[PDB]
């Protein structure tokens, strides 16, 4: 059985780079049960605050690399280095909110605080995994702290999420009324990223063209150096697995697996 290229670009030209789809495992064609979108969509009135006068913004007359950048200060500091990668000191456990520069800033569109809004730069592939359906892998080495892709989908209310049958593609935007990104019907490449118990990417809340704090955009950055061919994955969290472990178990394969049939059996036994 050969590896076949089934789609030259699942994004249909909407990303900076093509994202091909291949299958070397089984006879499944390229997934078509969803609509690919490169940016979040709305299917109801969300009333996002898009008032330009409500934007906090910088007065920077340089490239925004000084500690005088208001946008950086909103993030404690700008966390991007000269090549757009998170600093080694970045809090990978409890990430701060990132405020990127925006249309109200005095700075230029190429300033040092515009990583997420510049879109996908790394080379990714949608591929058929052995045991986890479709997944997303790197076609190249990716240093720690590199922006990968955004978690994109349909913005829905908590109450709408509570009525959705298929909850397998939900990303929660928790706050203190709350919202979800549902990637089931409308999503980007991130909808295909599997759970790994030892993750190589972390989600980060970012603000760009608006600063309505109810609607952070979710940016995945590598949490360590990623090798060519390595499957991308993040921790779906204990909530997902509480609901789902009764239906299927984790196939991540890691010695550190917390959600496999074996690991679940050890915990059920260790309970006695
Ligand atoms: C199965 O994984 C998740 C399920 C749900 C879920 N599920 C059900 C919807 C249909 N009803 C009948 C029962 C609940 N509801 C909600 N929310 C939003 C916040 C809390 N609200 C009070 C409840 C509505 N969030 C979820 C988040 C999930 O994983 C997120 C991480 C993994 N992603 C990245 C793949
Ligand atoms: N570690 C893991 N073990 C087993 N199945 C997983 C997994 N991570 C993700 N999945 C599967 O993928 C769903 C999340 S959506 C991720 C893409 C999915 N593999 C697909 O083919 O479309 C989960 O509900 C589960 O069905
Ligand atoms: Cl094609
Ligand atoms: Cl409102
Ligand atoms: Zn600035
Ligand atoms: Zn700037
Ligand atoms: Zn700015
Ligand atoms: Zn696992």
Swiss-Prot record:
Domain SET span(s) in chain numbering: 122-237
Annotated organism of origin: Homo sapiens (Human)
Pre-SET domain span: 56-119
Sequence positions that bind Zn(2+) 3: 64, 101, 107, 111
Binding site for S-adenosyl-L-methionine: 132-134, 169, 194-195, 251
Organism ancestry: Eukaryota, Metazoa, Chordata, Craniata, Vertebrata
Record-annotated site: Histone H3K9me binding: 151
Family: Belongs to the class V-like SAM-binding methyltransferase superfamily. Histone-lysine methyltransferase family. Suvar3-9 subfamily.
Tissue: Expressed in all tissues examined, with high levels in fetal liver, thymus, lymph node, spleen and peripheral blood leukocytes and lower level in bone marrow.
Stretch of the intact protein here: 917 to 1190 of 1210
Protein's cellular compartments: Nucleus; Chromosome
The name this protein goes by in its record: Histone-lysine N-methyltransferase EHMT2
